[model samples]
Target: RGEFSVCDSVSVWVADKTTATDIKGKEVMVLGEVNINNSVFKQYFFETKCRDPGCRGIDSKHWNSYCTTTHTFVKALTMDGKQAAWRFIRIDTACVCVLSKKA
Candidate 1:
């Protein structure tokens, strides 16, 4: 039996060149998703934690629930001329319970 997990929504900052006027580059806080029609388009990071420290597995053994991540593209204003551009950023999207290989 696996400990399943408790899922929740979280956020992460994405730094890019923008016109906001903050330390030269733009730092944006993301929540979920920003549409194309919006002035700012971004996707926020989601994270999860297992119900238990170790997930129950076969033969009464236990495994670890590791946090996993992926990336997405966000729209930003270029520093050069305040033009629109896209930036790649990282975000945690899911969590997985897998067997540990360490001894």
Candidate 2:
């Protein structure tokens, strides 16, 4: 590794109802909201945070570490407490140490 940099994987939960076919295995927390409350018909998310307090290096002052993320499609609960076909959500995949683009 370059200068003790880390790009660790953090697992979070976003589940589908049984009817939609359970894809994600580990269940950390399944957050949901029914349409009855607000304009949001249905909502759910993979509560994730990238734990990068510091990346040690001689260039640590010049470099910064951040979480790499991607959009994953999972089933979102419907207004009726059912699973929707597919929903887009952002999740962290790994940490990345990169230099600032700006001079």
Candidate 3:
């Protein structure tokens, strides 16, 4: 069986930005936190089966292991540009974690 596009590493998918060359904005979805420094850094994993009907014989095991997210922040230069703040995030799901704090 043949397949395509296996993924790896903790990556960031900022809303309006894809690449450094891409027009990056100051908004983001706080998916999770980084596994850096120490303590309270949570991680997750996602795996999917390929359901592409065109494949006669191919592995549809596309997945991304170790995915984490953090709040996106920006300095409102229009206001003061002295401090930065998150672009804010939302929880869109049937079930969500109402965390008192980070994990």
Candidate 4:
């Protein structure tokens, strides 16, 4: 998953979608800008979800284990000095790896 930014003063474009790859077993952070117009009155909101069905929760146990699975983390930030909000989901993968050495 990834994080996106939006302006607090304007309505967020809900139809906008973004995607990220090579996130498996790695941590990532995303940042963007939100445009706010004075004419708008409603508060802007942001949300994210996994496009893949298999990836839903961290402890879903859908695959063999959690460590070898793919996951997504999403967050939304406002320009009004409010703290950034976030959510996360996980995806299962068939490829699992372990780090080991011969004794």
Candidate 5:
């Protein structure tokens, strides 16, 4: 899951397909001068820490169970600002929520 804002405003949480679609539904495309701004985008990422670099199937589980994850941020919004007709990646890494956008 990931958390971000639209055009540096409005806090949004994207976790599941329903949630993602819900957030991006019909709004992203229509909105102009919009881009995603995510603080952290966690995925089943790997790095040198996992020198093993060899995990898939059952092994994949093991690798995932214990692997060094690189601090990953959003590479791209993929969506316009917060709309549908896009976003279809489900890494199922972990749930990231916003306690409060106090910042």
Candidate 6:
């Protein structure tokens, strides 16, 4: 069976200091959409994993095709004092393909 496909591109947003600090150590909600080809399926599962060795796993929830995540990162300052730096993570999904039977 073919594995679930992921979009070649993803949109990412880093929370600013004010937002980060406000939600620090708390479960912040995140929402996004994943485009899929027109096909039949049973259900889809979404997961997130920290690219950093020391980072923790983030829990995610799904409603229909749309998914929401409750995990966010702790922010840090960059040496350049321009942009903030945060840990990297990977998001993936699994889809169950539908099967058909003919007479």
On lDDT, the leading prediction is: 2
The residue pairs that clash in candidate 3, if any, are 32-69, 40-103, 50-60
lDDT of 5 by residue, 1-103 (tens): 6763211212234432222222323322221122337445432222122232212222332233322322232222345443433333222232222222222
1-103, model 4: which lDDT tens digit per residue?
A: 6753211112224333332222243332322444346443332224332232222232333242212323334333222224333323122222322233323
User: How does each model score on TM-score?
Assistant: 0.33, 0.33, 0.17, 0.18, 0.17, 0.19
Residue 81 lDDT, candidate 4, scale 0-100? 27
How much is 43 displaced in model 4, in angstroms? Answer: 24
Write down the TM-score for model 5: 0.17
TM-score of 1: 0.33
- How well is each residue in 1-103 modelled by candidate 6, as lDDT tens digits? 9553321223344332222222334322222222237653321223342222111121223212222233433323222234434422323322222222322
lDDT of 5 at 10: 22
Candidate with better lDDT, 4 vs 5: 4
Q: Candidate 2 on 1-103: residue-level lDDT in tens?
A: 5454454445565444223223453323334554544665435345444464544353555565454544444545422245443433334344554455333
Model 5 residue runs over 4 Å out of place are: 1-49, 53-67, 80-103
The 10-residue segment with the lowest total lDDT in model 3: 91-100
The residue-by-residue lDDT of candidate 3 on 1-103, one tens digit each, is 6563332223333333211111144333332444344655432322222222112222335421222222322321111134323232221112111222222
lDDT of each: 0.38, 0.43, 0.27, 0.30, 0.28, 0.28
Ranking 2 against 6 by TM-score, winner: 2
**Compared to the true structure, candidate 3 yields what TM-score?**
0.17
How far off is residue 4 in model 6, in Å?
2.7
Using TM-score as the measure, name the better of candidate 3 and candidate 6. 6
